[PDB]
Motif scaffolding. Sequence first.
Motif, PDB file in Angstrom:
ATOM      1  N   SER D   1       0.840  -1.179   0.000  1.00  0.00           N
ATOM      2  CA  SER D   1       0.000   0.000   0.000  1.00  0.00           C
ATOM      3  C   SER D   1       0.886   1.243   0.000  1.00  0.00           C
ATOM      4  O   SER D   1       1.869   1.290   0.732  1.00  0.00           O
ATOM      5  CB  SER D   1      -0.907  -0.042   1.215  1.00  0.00           C
ATOM      6  OG  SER D   1      -0.171  -0.530   2.326  1.00  0.00           O
ATOM      7  N   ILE D   2       0.568   2.210  -0.866  1.00  0.00           N
ATOM      8  CA  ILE D   2       1.373   3.424  -1.043  1.00  0.00           C
ATOM      9  C   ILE D   2       0.458   4.603  -1.009  1.00  0.00           C
ATOM     10  O   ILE D   2      -0.663   4.504  -1.474  1.00  0.00           O
ATOM     11  CB  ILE D   2       2.126   3.471  -2.390  1.00  0.00           C
ATOM     12  CG1 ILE D   2       2.798   2.136  -2.709  1.00  0.00           C
ATOM     13  CG2 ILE D   2       3.052   4.693  -2.456  1.00  0.00           C
ATOM     14  CD1 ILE D   2       1.989   1.328  -3.721  1.00  0.00           C
ATOM     15  N   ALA D   3       0.923   5.718  -0.471  1.00  0.00           N
ATOM     16  CA  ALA D   3       0.098   6.918  -0.369  1.00  0.00           C
ATOM     17  C   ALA D   3       0.499   7.938  -1.419  1.00  0.00           C
ATOM     18  O   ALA D   3       1.644   7.938  -1.880  1.00  0.00           O
ATOM     19  CB  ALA D   3       0.210   7.536   1.028  1.00  0.00           C
ATOM     20  N   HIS D   4      -0.474   8.720  -1.884  1.00  0.00           N
ATOM     21  CA  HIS D   4      -0.146   9.899  -2.674  1.00  0.00           C
ATOM     22  C   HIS D   4       0.821  10.743  -1.835  1.00  0.00           C
ATOM     23  O   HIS D   4       0.530  11.026  -0.662  1.00  0.00           O
ATOM     24  CB  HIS D   4      -1.379  10.733  -3.028  1.00  0.00           C
ATOM     25  CG  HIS D   4      -2.393  10.014  -3.854  1.00  0.00           C
ATOM     26  ND1 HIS D   4      -3.208  10.673  -4.751  1.00  0.00           N
ATOM     27  CD2 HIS D   4      -2.752   8.710  -3.903  1.00  0.00           C
ATOM     28  CE1 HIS D   4      -4.014   9.800  -5.331  1.00  0.00           C
ATOM     29  NE2 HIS D   4      -3.758   8.602  -4.833  1.00  0.00           N
ATOM     30  N   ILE D   6       2.509  14.036  -0.416  1.00  0.00           N
ATOM     31  CA  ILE D   6       1.969  15.347  -0.058  1.00  0.00           C
ATOM     32  C   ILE D   6       3.087  16.265   0.389  1.00  0.00           C
ATOM     33  O   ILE D   6       4.001  15.792   1.042  1.00  0.00           O
ATOM     34  CB  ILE D   6       0.974  15.175   1.127  1.00  0.00           C
ATOM     35  CG1 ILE D   6       0.122  13.924   0.912  1.00  0.00           C
ATOM     36  CG2 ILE D   6       0.104  16.389   1.349  1.00  0.00           C
ATOM     37  CD1 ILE D   6      -0.517  13.434   2.177  1.00  0.00           C
ATOM     38  N   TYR D  45       4.948   7.882   1.727  1.00  0.00           N
ATOM     39  CA  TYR D  45       4.785   6.732   2.611  1.00  0.00           C
ATOM     40  C   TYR D  45       4.381   5.488   1.858  1.00  0.00           C
ATOM     41  O   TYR D  45       3.688   5.561   0.848  1.00  0.00           O
ATOM     42  CB  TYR D  45       3.781   7.013   3.735  1.00  0.00           C
ATOM     43  CG  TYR D  45       3.380   5.761   4.487  1.00  0.00           C
ATOM     44  CD1 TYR D  45       4.312   5.037   5.222  1.00  0.00           C
ATOM     45  CD2 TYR D  45       2.067   5.309   4.471  1.00  0.00           C
ATOM     46  CE1 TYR D  45       3.950   3.884   5.901  1.00  0.00           C
ATOM     47  CE2 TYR D  45       1.697   4.165   5.154  1.00  0.00           C
ATOM     48  CZ  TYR D  45       2.639   3.457   5.869  1.00  0.00           C
ATOM     49  OH  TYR D  45       2.273   2.315   6.540  1.00  0.00           O
ATOM     50  N   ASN D  47       3.771   1.011   2.730  1.00  0.00           N
ATOM     51  CA  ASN D  47       3.689  -0.150   3.578  1.00  0.00           C
ATOM     52  C   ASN D  47       3.769  -1.451   2.789  1.00  0.00           C
ATOM     53  O   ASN D  47       3.012  -1.631   1.831  1.00  0.00           O
ATOM     54  CB  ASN D  47       2.375  -0.106   4.342  1.00  0.00           C
ATOM     55  CG  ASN D  47       2.194  -1.294   5.200  1.00  0.00           C
ATOM     56  OD1 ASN D  47       2.893  -1.469   6.193  1.00  0.00           O
ATOM     57  ND2 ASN D  47       1.285  -2.175   4.792  1.00  0.00           N
ATOM     58  N   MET D 104       1.328  -3.484  13.126  1.00  0.00           N
ATOM     59  CA  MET D 104       0.265  -2.769  12.413  1.00  0.00           C
ATOM     60  C   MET D 104       0.832  -1.597  11.619  1.00  0.00           C
ATOM     61  O   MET D 104       1.643  -0.837  12.137  1.00  0.00           O
ATOM     62  CB  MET D 104      -0.810  -2.261  13.378  1.00  0.00           C
ATOM     63  CG  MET D 104      -2.208  -2.770  13.047  1.00  0.00           C
ATOM     64  SD  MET D 104      -3.478  -1.713  13.739  1.00  0.00           S
ATOM     65  CE  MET D 104      -4.087  -0.874  12.268  1.00  0.00           C
ATOM     66  N   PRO D 105       0.409  -1.452  10.355  1.00  0.00           N
ATOM     67  CA  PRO D 105       0.953  -0.431   9.444  1.00  0.00           C
ATOM     68  C   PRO D 105       0.726   0.968   9.964  1.00  0.00           C
ATOM     69  O   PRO D 105      -0.369   1.263  10.425  1.00  0.00           O
ATOM     70  CB  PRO D 105       0.164  -0.648   8.149  1.00  0.00           C
ATOM     71  CG  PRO D 105      -0.388  -2.032   8.266  1.00  0.00           C
ATOM     72  CD  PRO D 105      -0.679  -2.214   9.737  1.00  0.00           C
ATOM     73  N   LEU D 106       1.715   1.838   9.805  1.00  0.00           N
ATOM     74  CA  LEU D 106       1.651   3.159  10.410  1.00  0.00           C
ATOM     75  C   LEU D 106       2.229   4.240   9.476  1.00  0.00           C
ATOM     76  O   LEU D 106       3.313   4.094   8.902  1.00  0.00           O
ATOM     77  CB  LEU D 106       2.399   3.124  11.750  1.00  0.00           C
ATOM     78  CG  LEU D 106       1.990   4.044  12.905  1.00  0.00           C
ATOM     79  CD1 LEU D 106       2.874   3.814  14.125  1.00  0.00           C
ATOM     80  CD2 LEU D 106       2.003   5.501  12.506  1.00  0.00           C
ATOM     81  N   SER D 107       1.489   5.336   9.372  1.00  0.00           N
ATOM     82  CA  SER D 107       1.813   6.455   8.518  1.00  0.00           C
ATOM     83  C   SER D 107       2.106   7.650   9.401  1.00  0.00           C
ATOM     84  O   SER D 107       1.345   7.973  10.330  1.00  0.00           O
ATOM     85  CB  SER D 107       0.655   6.754   7.545  1.00  0.00           C
ATOM     86  OG  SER D 107       0.807   7.989   6.844  1.00  0.00           O
ATOM     87  N   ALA D 109       2.254  10.673   8.377  1.00  0.00           N
ATOM     88  CA  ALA D 109       1.701  11.858   7.730  1.00  0.00           C
ATOM     89  C   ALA D 109       1.170  12.895   8.718  1.00  0.00           C
ATOM     90  O   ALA D 109       1.216  14.098   8.468  1.00  0.00           O
ATOM     91  CB  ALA D 109       0.594  11.444   6.767  1.00  0.00           C
ATOM     92  N   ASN D 110       0.711  12.424   9.868  1.00  0.00           N
ATOM     93  CA  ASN D 110       0.121  13.303  10.856  1.00  0.00           C
ATOM     94  C   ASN D 110       1.138  14.265  11.455  1.00  0.00           C
ATOM     95  O   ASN D 110       0.770  15.329  11.961  1.00  0.00           O
ATOM     96  CB  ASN D 110      -0.538  12.455  11.943  1.00  0.00           C
ATOM     97  CG  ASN D 110      -2.035  12.325  11.749  1.00  0.00           C
ATOM     98  OD1 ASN D 110      -2.675  13.156  11.077  1.00  0.00           O
ATOM     99  ND2 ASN D 110      -2.598  11.244  12.283  1.00  0.00           N
ATOM    100  N   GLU D 113       0.304  17.432   9.636  1.00  0.00           N
ATOM    101  CA  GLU D 113      -1.066  17.971   9.501  1.00  0.00           C
ATOM    102  C   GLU D 113      -1.003  19.434   9.873  1.00  0.00           C
ATOM    103  O   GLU D 113      -1.588  20.273   9.183  1.00  0.00           O
ATOM    104  CB  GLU D 113      -2.116  17.186  10.319  1.00  0.00           C
ATOM    105  CG  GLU D 113      -2.851  17.971  11.419  1.00  0.00           C
ATOM    106  CD  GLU D 113      -4.172  18.594  10.979  1.00  0.00           C
ATOM    107  OE1 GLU D 113      -4.664  19.473  11.721  1.00  0.00           O
ATOM    108  OE2 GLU D 113      -4.720  18.204   9.921  1.00  0.00           O
TER     109      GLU D 113
END
Lengths: 150, 150, 362, 179, 152
Positions: D1-4, D6, D45, D47, D104-107, D109-110, D113
Amino acid sequence: DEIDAMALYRAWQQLDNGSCAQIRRVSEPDELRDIPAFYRLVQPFGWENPRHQQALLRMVFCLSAGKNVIRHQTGISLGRALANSGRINERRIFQLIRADRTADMVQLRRLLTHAEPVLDWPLMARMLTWWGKRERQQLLEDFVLTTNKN
Amino acid sequence: DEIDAMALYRAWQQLDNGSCAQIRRVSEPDELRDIPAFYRLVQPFGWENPRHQQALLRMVFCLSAGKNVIRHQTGISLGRALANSGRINERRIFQLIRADRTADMVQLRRLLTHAEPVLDWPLMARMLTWWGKRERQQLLEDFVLTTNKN
Amino acid sequence: MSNFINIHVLISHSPSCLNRDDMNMQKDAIFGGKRRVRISSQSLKRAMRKSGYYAQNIGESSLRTIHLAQLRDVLRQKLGERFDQKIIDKTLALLSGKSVDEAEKISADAVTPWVVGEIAWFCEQVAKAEADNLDDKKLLKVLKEDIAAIRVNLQQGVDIALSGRMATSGMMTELGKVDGAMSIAHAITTHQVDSDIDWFTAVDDLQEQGSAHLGTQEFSSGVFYRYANINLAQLQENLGGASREQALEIATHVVHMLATEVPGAKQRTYAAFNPADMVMVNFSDMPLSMANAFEKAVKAKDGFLQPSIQAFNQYWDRVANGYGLNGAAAQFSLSDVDPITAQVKQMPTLEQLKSWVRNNGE
Amino acid sequence: SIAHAITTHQVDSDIDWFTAVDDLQEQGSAHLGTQEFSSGVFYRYANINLAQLQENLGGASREQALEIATHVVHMLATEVPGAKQRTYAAFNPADMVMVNFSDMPLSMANAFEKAVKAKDGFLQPSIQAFNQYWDRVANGYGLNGAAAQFSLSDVDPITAQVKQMPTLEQLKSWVRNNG
Amino acid sequence: YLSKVIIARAWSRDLYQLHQGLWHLFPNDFLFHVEKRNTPEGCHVLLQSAQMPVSTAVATVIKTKQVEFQLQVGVPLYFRLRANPIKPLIKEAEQIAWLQRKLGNAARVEDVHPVCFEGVLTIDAPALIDLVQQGIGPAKSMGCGLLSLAPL
RNA sequence: AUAAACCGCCAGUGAUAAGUGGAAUGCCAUGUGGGCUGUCGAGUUCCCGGCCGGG
DNA sequence: AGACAGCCCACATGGCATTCCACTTATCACTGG
């Protein structure tokens, strides 16, 4: 240039679960106009004839009482079959008549759901297209006289 | 004191490449207020009066799909032409109807770009000024119907 | 002492799309005057059920089907080792109220949650009755007498005890229908959100003169408020008379998931694997939801998160002092925004908060 | 899993105005244009689910999975989309790469914010945000998983439950050997 | 007196609106320089004035540092002279020369670029103080002619 | 300037009392917006003081 | 002041519940041509 009531009936019976359900959710008759499956169902049967669509709306809405409460067989009046159910009280019918336009179609659908009636569909269809003070009156008269026969 | 839609159409057609393109660049419809060429174009047509300008905004934004995607000919509705294209899928039209305010103008413009539609401009124009309450429903109806004849 | 345990969570996701409707649009919701992005209670629930945390700490989730044919096949394997087939079939038939003949397709009234352990126990009972030459109705009368026995089978499958069962056709209609111990709300954003649209391309390696597909997708970043309620006496009842400690155990496990679990879509393409930034837990006599803190949609200052936590604390202060609440409360947060009302005890780690719920607010 | 990916910070995009100069007309330009562009500090990011990867390869070994994973880390730290690179040439290497094993997968990104404010550039405070937030998440949610970080410029150190790799190749080796 | 005024949007769209709006601050001769325009609150403006401006309902005043001038010849100062050269001077040389005409008389320029003139000059002190009070060039009521000094 | 002319159907009155529409429920898996581009050119205009200088 | 692109392309699948329930009472004028 009328609406082939029986063809429409069969058409409603032939609908996919998705559409039988999609139309059944509808609260008021006009919300049918937000449904695409509605337009698809009705269009051959002369929708797109302005002077036809109000009628078409009512017929579909009453069928939309679902799932199969309206069961078809001189002919059998809606009033007669509503009485033949024995579920419906006279007062309620009176109320159907006394209610203003859109309300009256709604209330009727509620009645149909409760009664699970055995009518002569194309007849009911005719009565439903011409729906009017006279037609209402006849609904009363047939109901009371039938409910009284019994 | 309405907006002379055809007059606007021809005015848009008559624009110098610099201004036609300058307006084409706009991403969202409200950004039209930052371009002087917008003010110049709209100026004869009554943008001076509030609650004329929202309409004018939508109309221009829909023209700005460019370059000449809106081709004018009982009248031919936007829904009709979107079906007559045959490129556009029902699901997209649904997203347009369901869409919140600015987004809906955007997705619409995107559709226009995709369809290269053949409408009756002033009809669609009017429809755009009152956009949209019935209009959404109305366009759905037109689309599904035209799409189902086929 | 206190019967309701309230779980408040503030969690911020990065750009994502965590709940779609029929049109693959995000799930909108309006509050109190502004659009908010919504994640459905159902998604939350199933996210927690189907979760690995649950499998590790609660046990097996329930089996939800409308298809009785497949069900009877499964039950035939497992309990086929434990009971006679004729007995199993009959047990399914009584609970279901539907006729279980070998036929390819047999369907229940509606999608229903099943617990195999439960069915096993019912099979024991049907075995006793059938051998004893007891009539079905008599059996029903006897089983009605002790409900709890049927509910301890719930302990094997807890999600049912949490969110409940409905029945329309079977013996299940009489005995095994359950009120949810936990009531949960669809999570919504603290702030207004206008959804972004991402414009994608699918590039076809075999056509040079264009793309093979063009499309759009809705997506948003958002700060979400999740709220959930656990009724404790109800949970104990639904488990067949379990102690407050077992209840509280389940409650903390729920807290953990409520802070930690995110629905699966479309995480592989947007990957909002975000943890909760704010978790607050209070004991009370009557349930309380702090959603009203955000009726005024929070305006961003240094982000949405901080002023949202601020809003939360402030409202909770007003409510707690207005209605004179004096329940045990603890708050764990990732950001340095401190709570106003003492006593809201401050927990440095989630595990400490969790241990605090287990000890009943100490 | 990959995020756009930012930007860590708020961005107001610049607009560049094109001219296409026509060698056959001496007075004006033949074309005028515009293009949006920005500089930015981006957070990427991704995972990798390892069990799933092993499954998807038909029962491949943990080491094969990790092999593929290291390859990913490298690309994620290294690859930039091609457009419009021939005209803007943002061939930039990653300034910070962090890899952690977990249950557990963790981002993270926060961490951003709160849009990061420029201090001595955006990069430095971006790494600041990241690290402080990592510290907070890691202590708060009590995770004790294998973690290593490689950066060109720390400021910034995370409390040292992160092994520090002076070079990316060493980071890659750390992932290949599973921490 | 050095003021930091913001003019509201409806009252700063045009330049004459700016001059009138900043004139209306004196119910009791000035020079103004625009930092930023067309923000949602309107024009962000640094204002040099003989009298102390009074906050209008169109031109809010954020602060007022009065000044008294302590200049020494030879001392290096940064400077931003927003001004306007004409006879309209399009050449770079011509602009720089223009600067160093007025300022050449008062204080030598050691570096500069361009119109907003940013640079470094070195300093006669009374002649220069006088020149700052006076303003420099055309359009003194259009935003130009305001020189601000800053020490290194 | 007519089976016409003149020519009241009038008066009084609550439609009322009771009532959960309710229990269960992931919308979900796939996807580059991408290829080309000097902002050059250029001194434009309202009143008073001998090109220069004040609003 | 002058000038402001073009092409090409736009998804499929499958799924839509059930149970049960629908009032009753008192009461409906007299007078004059």
